[PDB]
Amino acid sequence: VKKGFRAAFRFQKELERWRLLRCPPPPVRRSEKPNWDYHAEVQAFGSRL
Amino acid sequence: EQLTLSAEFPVPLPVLRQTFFAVIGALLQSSGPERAALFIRDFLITQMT
Amino acid sequence: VLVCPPLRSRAYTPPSDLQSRLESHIKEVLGSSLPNNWQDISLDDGHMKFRLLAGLADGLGHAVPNSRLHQMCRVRDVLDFYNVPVQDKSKFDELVASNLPPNLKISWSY
Amino acid sequence: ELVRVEATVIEKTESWPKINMKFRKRKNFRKKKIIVNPQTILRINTIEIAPRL
Amino acid sequence: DPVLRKCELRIPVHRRPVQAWVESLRGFEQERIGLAELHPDVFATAPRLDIVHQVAIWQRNFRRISYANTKTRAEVSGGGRKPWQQKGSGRARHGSIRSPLWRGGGVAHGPRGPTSYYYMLPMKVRALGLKVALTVKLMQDDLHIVDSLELPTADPQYLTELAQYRHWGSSVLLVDLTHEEMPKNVVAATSGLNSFNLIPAVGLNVYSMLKHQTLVLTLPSVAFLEDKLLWQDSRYTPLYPFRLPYSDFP
Amino acid sequence: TGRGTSSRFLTSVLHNGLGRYVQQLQRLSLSLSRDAPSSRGAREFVEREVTDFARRNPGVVVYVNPRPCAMPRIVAEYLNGAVREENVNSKSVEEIKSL
Ligand SMILES: [Mg+2]
Ligand SMILES: [Mg+2]
Ligand SMILES: [Mg+2]
Ligand SMILES: [Mg+2]
16 A cells, blocks of 8 residues: 555546446536526627627 | 527437527528528538538 | 724725825924925924824824835825825726626636 | 639648657657647638630 | 834944834734834845745754664574575575565665754854844734733633734734743633744744744844844854853853 | 557538638636636736637637636637647746637
């Protein structure tokens, strides 16, 4: 048992990657995910075009 | 697709198609025929290249 | 069973009637009817400096920091120092209330 | 006068990493460089001619 | 009745003195009760942060003793005989089962025994560091000169609220002239507080000043500190240890 | 490395330059810490350059989230559905602005 938590922290990230590949997550609409404001998104839609 | 409001995600194609033309309709009312004609040329006529 | 006065803000804005209040204190402390060249009266006397600065802090509410006392050589310096505003607003706080474009959004999670 | 060709700038990007590893005795796996270059993409729009031969 | 203090020692003619507000702790609002002068050579030295770095590191390192240890191949149990003969076996040549190459063998280059890190900085250099630290706190508005440490009540809560009222830092270091005579009220209030610490004047050091946000000095201590530090300037080298009798030195 | 990696042909998202050019980037997210030496450069970028960048590019929605953080990070999302993520740990204002 080596001293330190940084290697343990890194490995948790890789276990996350492996799990995603084997069991892909079901799709979700972007509204549910963070960083969403409906009013601002609509205005940018027009200006984009 | 991101801005659509519906009860099912991913949005079914008939629902997605309908919202697309509704947007063109809203553009027609706001800015009139000449603008919309450019819109159809740029995004729909291009697809026959 | 003592009690504590509520905390204050640390923001100070130069009062409009700065000249009137400043000179009025000077005449009272000097008691000499505003001699000409009043702006250049030396503050080297210890007793004079305490009375002028102590009274001003109580009334206005703003006091000279310990670092800046040695610079207050003449009455002009006291006049100059009190005419600069002090605001405690954060640089972020100014940014929020600065007429941000429509496509910029900010949120404070602290 | 004869010919006019017009184009448009579509994308400004960088290349994928390219590996350069010189041949030397005691090569080693860490004596290596990665080269990435900037790139740009143009779309040709029109070609026009005029009767001035 | 303003409290006005003047430096006992002679200020250089070319240097103007510096001043600070005298305060008292008897009430929440007795912020200003006097005006005081401080010797420029103490509280207005050049801002040298390299010297502050040296004295802080000296304090931390001159006490260090490390107790890490390892055994060499000589001190591990057993290992006397030659395991097998040089030729014929077809194994690698070996002469002891306790060499560093073997499992359970000795360590080739490991820590050896208790080791000390002792050294001493020159006395003038250590004295200079104290002046620079005092200057830094004043110029950054973290120093508060006070006439005395007397307190109205011994409740610890009162002292904490007072610090909040006057915009002090989360950690406060309080200095008094001597240990034996420190007021009873202060001792009871501080003893129960982790971040408010009370020390005598002779215990002042660069390291504690950096650790604590704001410094509080009583007026008698200010004269005490001024005397000792300025003596280091304008002195001879020692003929023999200063604790021995001298013509004009305590 | 070519035989060890995938490849593709040159293309454009929706014939970008034929009729009208449309900017593909549509969203930026930046996370910060109030008081942390690592994120000092990102803080200055918000103070100076964030607003000006938003005006020059009006089709991009920008989100700024101060919170207790260990590494400041930027997330960029595009119309075709791609997502890209970059660490901004202890970088200068000029580095972030050019990025
Ligand atoms: Mg032996
Ligand atoms: Mg033998
Ligand atoms: Mg041997
Ligand atoms: Mg062993």
